Every structure is written in structure tokens, then in C-alpha cells.
Ligand binder design. Structure first.
Ligand SMILES: CCOc1nc(N)nc2c1C(=O)N([C@@H]1CCCC[C@@H]1O)C2
Ligand SMILES: CCOc1nc(N)nc2c1C(=O)N([C@@H]1CCCC[C@@H]1O)C2
Ligand SMILES: N[C@@H](CCCC[NH3+])C(=O)O
Ligand SMILES: N[C@@H](CCCC[NH3+])C(=O)O
Lengths: 462, 462
């Protein structure tokens, strides 16, 4: 609290002295990593004539006499510690240097009874705030910058999420997918059931809506002649937060002409497995529960109605009235579809461990997905539940316009108190070849793979 | 207008007949491209026993007698045209098929006095809207889906923008950069001078601000130990539209520890050149003006004050009063910095052809960029003007906090009528190693490379 001020003192009396604590440039030559990787086994307490210039953060100090010792930590986490040139050197070192301070050092590299000793040295930046040694998982998230410095785990994760996301891109691109960019500000926001964030434009004297999802535009792409498209990026759903939900988040969507939810469920499996392999290296996923979640080999596929039927010891179908459902609903603790999914989730959903697609969903609650090819009353959507998390949905995509138009009229009357995406429908009545969309949640993906909270999967939330 | 209805008729009387015009699946085996690429020179009017199943869009028809002919166009643009099985076949073909209709065909492939002839065939989708044969550059943008189908140029561009953006990622990643993701909804929006879009959260009973730029968060990353970071993605600036300006757009930012605006100007050059090469294949850039813009080899670097001095036949410096500037301003047609840039742009800026960085900018108007190392009164920012477009800016980055804090107080009093990013400043007073940010505009990048309007560079604007 106090030593805040002391650090400011130390800054001032380096300006007026004309030494620079925020130098433009400082001729670093190697990363601590690069040093390590060059010099694995050096005979301890022998020397080598590799001059280098390295920068780092002083995190351990042990100042004593003619000689000070200190740990330098590259930002990536790597570590290298530190007669030679000048006593004034030592006095500045002793008097000027605190911890959390960024420091360049020149010199040759040696083994300690692996450090370096100084031709030159200089401050690259003066911290006017000492690093704390514990911090609340909440304070942590509010100051990720410190987290990242002091807490290793923050580092690896941040890097992982990145590694994963590269993995995804690598994979889709290997399969001949083209990443596209579609609007975020939209005249009306479609592609999912969520309340949008609305904002005012000065330029058009109108409101605008942050995209809850890209599907409608991504579809317009397929129309326009895209074989295979994805768009990995952020969506905004104006609603509550919870372990699995957060109002802005990063989402994959995917679309493949000439293929069905059967095929896309396959891709989605391989996709996820490739990711694990690229970014983690095992399909036997370690967890803070000491446990290991296996995701290798093949994954089960069950139907919603069937699997639910077995669960309630009773046949349930598209046919089953609301009253029956409602009643069964009560026996345990709006409309048909909503009840089926509720019941399904509430019974079969919860119970699952290993990786499982469910498929064949109540039409009532899947207006964008095609009617099932043989079975009446249902659509060709899957969900994919992975270690007990709804991670992804695939669809055989509703290409028919008039069906689709109807699909909305019903949805629309649903919340009336007395406007459709006419352009989207225009799009469809130009032709849209058969295709299967997926959607996947990137935090849930990591969460599902790791057991980390949604608050740890991303750099900066609130 | 009328033939709208006829197409709907044709749809209905295929449902009630139990044939399907929006089939879930249709067993395509090859893309028209794949066919072509397999069968270059086939002896014309000879045959081959490669059965395949291909889909396409019927765009040319010539129905006549026992035999109909029609061009099929893959979405990517490729083309293949089309006794065998059944007369009913021909009757459906004649009666059922219109243009813009998506069509699967099975059979073996042959050379025409390169088409295919039909084992099987089926509709994959029925267009209830005929393609128009011209359309306004505005109507075009409002229905990109049609544009893409009927207008080749729409295609290539869409693909280019994608190719470019992959190029960028390829390049940065080759140089050891890590793409990150930072908030879009921000408690206050910083990183540039623009009015934000504001939106209400239901959850927090508060307003929120769409990011005008990532710099502040991207900086917090560098603090946290990122060596090299970028973030390619969308920003929102709540302001006018014009040939170079649009309220939501896609932007690269970049940050490199231990390097200066000198270095980043180098990267930015190589980056741009690599892109051209990957996505275009020449640095001698063809244009609708018949002309060619050369971007190869090295590019000029001039200083703002100097270059302006020469322009007005008079010495201008940090020192030059507002009154003088204002006066010179009048001689041709707020504050110091604003005048210098205005004058510079208005005189030297306009005059440039070949690719040129300007550097050494008035501090007044660059609060985030470090003070120049030797020269007083200026900062270490460059702009990069490419074929007469402001495409990119680099900075040697202001790491000092107290300076930075001050920088804002001045900015803030500037628009007072009587709140700073305290967290950002907190971040900085933990330490931020010397580094150089860039920012680049993706549409301007393409615009600069091609001569295409900002309205053609993106898929869906308004
Ligand atoms: C990380 C928080 O993720 C989400 N937050 C909200 N608020 N809503 C959704 C997710 C998420 O991951 N979603 C996915 C969307 C595609 C299908 C799987 C899943 O529903 C919805
Ligand atoms: C395609 C429209 O681009 C822009 N629109 C607005 N409204 N503002 C800017 C751009 C753009 O490309 N910008 C760039 C930002 C980084 C530095 C170069 C350039 O200023 C600002
Ligand atoms: N739009 C879906 C994702 C794609 C589903 C397949 N078309 C969602 O928001 O969940
Ligand atoms: N934030 C800048 C781009 C990065 C400049 C370098 N720090 C802008 O909005 O133009």
C-alpha cells in the first residue's frame, strides 16, 4: 500500500538523473527459452563464451555485498537467474531495483555452483506496484495481467485456448473449409432463441442488434455457392450468466453442402479428437478430480423419444399430448417440444457420463432444421453431450422456404401481443443445396476438456 | 414477377406427388471442378466409363425433343453441361425444371460434339425466384447471395478477401505470433478516438460499449507476458460512412516486445508483400484503371514536420504556434496537432503516389505512443499511405504510466463540460516491456490492393 509511493520516488529520481526507466529500445538478442534450449547440460560451475542480451522480470532477489542474485522470468514463464563492470552498477542495482521490474542484461552465460553475468544492464520498465505473492478466483479474473505473471496455470490455459483454436482452424482448413466474416450489427438478429443486445446508430437514426448467431448469413453464403464455410467468432445473447452461460462468447458454426447430420456428427467427433491431440496430446483427459475422461474411439448415438420412453417406462412420441407430458412432468418435479426436451434433459440427459449424441428432436423446437426423412413429427438435429455438457448441435438444414416461412409464423404468433426475416426467406427461395450446419461453444469445449470454469477459459470476462 | 407463382405451383405438385424437392441427402460423388481436373483433354465426342454423381445449378437450358441440354454451375463457378433411362424422365425434365434450380445427376462422363448423361437424376432444390440476367451496385450488395451466383467478380473477391486473411494469419504465425481474443463489450471503450455504440445489459442494469479497438486489452496481454500477439477481428466506431469509413469493420492489431516503430514498419511492409504474393501472385498490382501499382522492393520514409516544412516553403516544428498554423491553414482553404496533420494531409498527404511511411507525429494527437527518443515534441508513430490510402499505423508504445495518466487528463479536460481507464493504468504500473503496436484496416488493405469499393470488399454491409 505504502511502497506504492516509494516506487514512484524511484522513477522520478531516474528521470531527473537522465537515466531512462521506459526506454524505447533495448537490444535483446535471445529469449530465456532460446538460451535454455541452446544450453541444456553445461558442466555446472564451468563457463562458455556465448555473449547474449536477455530481458526478463526480476521476481526473486538476494542482494548481498559485492554480489546480488535474482531470478529473471520471461513472460512465457521461463527462468534464468543473474568485477564484471562497475560498483556504481551494484549501487544502482541495490538502490534502484525492486521486484516485478523488467530488466535487460548483457553478458556471457554460465552455470551456477544457469544464470548470466553482466557486461551491461539497464531497466526496461519500473513497476510502481509490487506483485502480490494469494488472490480470489474473482480478483484473479479482474486482473488477468497479474494472474498471468504470478500464476503459471493462468499461462498454460491462455496458451491452450489459443492452441485449441488454431487446431480447429487447422482441421477445418485441412478439410477444405473457408472461414468467412458476416455482420455483427444486424437489422434484426436471428439464428437462435435469445434476447439480443440493441444499440442505437447515430448515422441511421435507428436501432441495431448484435448477432446472437451467424447461421442466417452463413446460409446466404451456401446459397451464393459456398461448398464449405465456417465462422469462428463472437456472439451476443442478452441473458443470464451461469456455469455454462455468458452473454458474449466465442462460437464455431460450420456448413457442408451435400451431407446430413449423420456426416456432421462424424466430423464433429473427429474435429474434437484432433483438437485434443494437437492442443493436449492425449484423448485420456486428466482432470482436477484426479480422474481421466476417455474420448477416444467411437461415441454413442441415441434418439430423444426412444431414450426418454425407456426412461419413463412408457412410450412417448410426437403424438403424446401436452397434458400427459405436463402430468409426467409433475410426477417428477408451455408446449410439447419444451416438455420433451425438459423431460429428456431432466431424466436421460443428466444421467450420461461418456460422450453421446442424441438425435431426432421435436420439430416444435427446431424451426431451422429439416423434417426427419422417414420418422414423422421430428427433425434431423443432434446435440452432443460431452462429460455432461451440451457442447454442440448439428442439423440437416431446412432448405424448403415455404415450410421455413410457416415455421416462423408459428414462432411469431407464439410471442405476439395483438415481423419476419423476409430477406432470409428471399435467400432461400433462390435455392439452397442440401447441407448440414453445426454449432459449437468454445468455452464449453475447453470446459468439457479440462474441468476449468468458464471464467478461466477466457482472458477477460465480466 | 408472375412466374414467381408458377414455381410455387411446380413445388406443390411435387409434394402431393410424393417426389421430394428439398431432399435431405443426394449422393454426390464429385465437384464439377474435380471432374474437370480429372478429365482435361478427352477426345471430343468419344466416351469414358467413369460413372460419377455431380450436383449443380441449371443456368442454361435448351430443351428440344428427345434431348434436353443444360449448363450446370458448381457454386464455385465451374461449369459442366448435361435412351439413357426413361421418357417420363424427359417429361419431368421439360415440365418440372426451370433455371436457378439445383440438380443432381448420376452417370458417365463424355465429350460433346464436356457434359454428362444420366443414369439417374433428381431435384436438390426448386428455386421459386428466377435469377435476373443487370443490377445496381447497391441492389447487388443487398442481395450478395444472387450477386455471387450470377456475377463471377463477386465470387473471386469474396474468395480473395478470405485468401488474404489466411495469408495474414499464415505470416504472423510464421513469425511466432499468437492470435488472442479480447472483449467486445467493455465497461468503457478505449484504444482510439471514436464514438462507441452503447447497449443496455438486462443482467447488470448497466450500459456497455462495443470496442472501438483492442489495444488496451492487447497491451494488458503484453504486460501478462505475451511476447507477440495479434487479434484480427471486428471493431465498431459509431460515426459516418464514406469511401474509407464504415461503422463496423475488421481490423488487424499487432504487438511485439523488444522492437520499435522502425522494426514494425519493416514487418508491416513484408506482411503486406507476402499477402499480395499469396493471395494475388504479383506485386505489380493490376487495376480497373488499366494501370499497375508497384509495391515491390523498398518504400520511402519521411518525417511529418520536415516533409510539411518543405511543402509550405517554411520551417514548421513542435514549436510553431496555433496562430501561425491557423493562418497558413487559411492561406490555403482546435489545436496544434490537429492542424499539423490537417496541413500535412492537405498538402503532402494527398500528393503521394508510391508506398510511403510518414513518421514522427505531433504528441498532441498520439496519447498512446511513446515520446520520440531524441527529437522533442513528437512521438514514434508512423502512418503507411498506400496508393493514396491510410492503411496502417505503427507505434513505439508508451509504456510509462504516469506520463500516460497525464496524457489522458489532458485529453479528458479537452471534452469536459464542468473518468479514466484506471484499470488500464493499473495494468501499466505493473510493468510493460518496450514494444511496438500496429493497426491495419482489412478493407482498406484490399481496397488499396485492388481499387474495389469498400462496399465490394465485404460480404454483407449496410
Ligand atoms: C461459454 C458460454 O457459452 C454459452 N453462453 C450462452 N449464453 N449460450 C450458449 C453458450 C454456448 O456454448 N452455447 C452453444 C451454442 C451452440 C450449440 C451448443 C451450445 O448451446 C449456447
Ligand atoms: C473499411 C472501413 O475502415 C474504417 N472505418 C472506420 N470507420 N475507421 C477506420 C477504418 C480503418 O480502416 N481504420 C484504420 C484503423 C487502423 C489504422 C489505419 C486506419 O485508420 C480506421
Ligand atoms: N445456429 C445454431 C448453431 C448451428 C446449428 C446448425 N445449423 C445455434 O445457435 O445453436
Ligand atoms: N489502436 C490503434 C491501432 C494500433 C496502434 C499501435 N499501438 C488504432 O485504433 O488505430
Amino acid at each position: 500500500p505504502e511502497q506504492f509511493r516509494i516506487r514512484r520516488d524511484k522513477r522520478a529520481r531516474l528521470l531527473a538523473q537522465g537515466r531512462d526507466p521506459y526506454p524505447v529500445a533495448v537490444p535483446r538478442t535471445h529469449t530465456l527459452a532460446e538460451v535454455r534450449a541452446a544450453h541444456p547440460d553445461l558442466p555446472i560451475d564451468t563457463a562458455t563464451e556465448d555473449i547474449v542480451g536477455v530481458a526478463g522480470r526480476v521476481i526473486f532477489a538476494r542482494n548481498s555485498g559485492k554480489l546480488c542474485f535474482a531470478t529473471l522470468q520471461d513472460g512465457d514463464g521461463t527462468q534464468l537467474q543473474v568485477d564484471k563492470v562497475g560498483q556504481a552498477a551494484l549501487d544502482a542495482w541495490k538502490a534502484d531495483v525492486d521486484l516485478g521490474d523488467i530488466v535487460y542484461v548483457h553478458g556471457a552465460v554460465i552455470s551456477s555452483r544457469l544464470s548470466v553475468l553482466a557486461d551491461c544492464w539497464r531497466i526496461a520498465a519500473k513497476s510502481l506496484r509490487p506483485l502480490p505473492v494469494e488472490m480470489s478466483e474473482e480478483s484473479r479474473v479482474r486482473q488477468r495481467y497479474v494472474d498471468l505473471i504470478v500464476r503459471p496455470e493462468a499461462r498454460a490455459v491462455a496458451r491452450l485456448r489459443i492452441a485449441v483454436v488454431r487446431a480447429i482452424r487447422t482441421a477445418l482448413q485441412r478439410r477444405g473449409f473457408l472461414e468467412v466474416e458476416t455482420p455483427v450489427l444486424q437489422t434484426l438478429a436471428g439464428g437462435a432463441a435469445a434476447r439480443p443486445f440493441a444499440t442505437h446508430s447515430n448515422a441511421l437514426d435507428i436501432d441495431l442488434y448484435l448477432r446472437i448467431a451467424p447461421e442466417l448469413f452463413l446460409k446466404r453464403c451456401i446459397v451464393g455457392g459456398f461448398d464449405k464455410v465456417f465462422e469462428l467468432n463472437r456472439v451476443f445473447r442478452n441473458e443470464g450468466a451461469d456455469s455454462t452461460h455468458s452473454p458474449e462468447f466465442s462460437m464455431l458454426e460450420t456448413y457442408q453442402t451435400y451431407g446430413t447430420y449423420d456426416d456432421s456428427a462424424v466430423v464433429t467427433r473427429e474435429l474434437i479428437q484432433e483438437v485434443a491431440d494437437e492442443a493436449i496430446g492425449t484423448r485420456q483427459l486428466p482432470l482436477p478430480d484426479g480422474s481421466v475422461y476417455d474420448i477416444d474411439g467411437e461415441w454413442a448415438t441415441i434418439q430423444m423419444y426412444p431414450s426418454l420412453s425407456v426412461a419413463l417406462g412408457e412410450e412417448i412420441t410426437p403424438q403424446t399430448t401436452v397434458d400427459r407430458l405436463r402430468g409426467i412432468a409433475d410426477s417428477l418435479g408451455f408446449g410439447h417440444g419444451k416438455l420433451i426436451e425438459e423431460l429428456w434433459e431432466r431424466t436421460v440427459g443428466k444421467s450420461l457420463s461418456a460422450p453421446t449424441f442424441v438425435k431426432d428432436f421435436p420439430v416444435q423446437t427446431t424451426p431451422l432444421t429439416r423434417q426427419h426423412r422417414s420418422i414423422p413429427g421430428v427433425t434431423e438435429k443432434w446435440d452432443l453431450y460431452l462429460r455432461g455438457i451440451e457442447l454442440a448441435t448439428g442439423y440437416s438444414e431446412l432448405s424448403d422456404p415455404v415450410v421455413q416461412r410457416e415455421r416462423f409464423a408459428d414462432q411469431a404468433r407464439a410471442a405476439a401481443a395483438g415481423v419476419l426475416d423476409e430477406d432470409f426467406l428471399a435467400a432461400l427461395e433462390y435455392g439452397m443445396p442440401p447441407c448440414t450446419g453445426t454449432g459449437m461453444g468454445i468455452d464449453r469445449l475447453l470446459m468439457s476438456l479440462t474441468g476449468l470454469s468458464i471464467r478461466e477459459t477466457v482472458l477477460f470476462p465480466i
